[PDB]
Amino acid sequence: RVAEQARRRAIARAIRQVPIRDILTSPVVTVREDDTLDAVAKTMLEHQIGCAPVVDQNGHLVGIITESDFLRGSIPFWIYEASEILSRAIPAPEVEHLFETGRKLTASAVMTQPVVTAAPEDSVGSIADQMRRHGIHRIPVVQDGVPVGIVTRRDLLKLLLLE
């Protein structure tokens, strides 16, 4: 019983010392702050992702955008996935109005500012601590100014408990 605990303790400590870059196993997909929401939705759906770093024209991080952010512009992100299903609920000219609005607004209009960022050489444990300390759900990873990923609470729960 005691030895089992020592065993568990050592695994947990090892896991906290894993560098962030080791858990960034997907390619980073970003969007431009000037991309229209229509283009962002296409990009997200085409790569099967629900959030993305927003960068300026020269590739520097300026914000984060998620599906839920579309509601800040009064657009439900689902319109890009299932307009036919939603057209059963909402009349056609109103659906078209949502699309027209998505073609006008940009990522910059609804993105958020990240409260904290991490570097690829930071440890899993240090990022977990950030996550719990600010009670947030996503943290962008930046290497030399350039986004190289977003770490989510779901990613970390594959490795360790979060308080």
Next chain:
Amino acid sequence: RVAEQARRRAIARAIRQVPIRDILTSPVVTVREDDTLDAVAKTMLEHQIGCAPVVDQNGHLVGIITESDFLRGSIPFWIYEASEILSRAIPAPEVEHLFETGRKLTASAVMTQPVVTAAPEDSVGSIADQMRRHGIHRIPVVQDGVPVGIVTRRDLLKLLLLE
């Protein structure tokens, strides 16, 4: 300005009246309460899902299991995705011990009980209300005792704000 608000109001109202069964657009994948965690991991990774209803031998819902639940048995789910990366952190006999444990524990040993369930004829608004009121992140949809889906907070945020 006033006219736009009426427009947005009617859209928001329409969205709350969409029946749940309209948003269950993916096929339900379940696991058995007696499946080993090794098999559960395999199922979830084959189907690219992070949670699943747990059913009994005759198919009735008995629980919910997610990747994070593996930690309840002291196994990091990531071991099933990236054991080679984890082995740079953890000696090989210890990783093997994790695998051994996963082949012994079953879904029933780590699954959770759902505080609330929904029926497919219920509305989006009503399940959204359930989410916030119980402050939960996932709700199983059941049609005649049989799971037909799991609705998450992420799903709902494609449609409407929560609290």
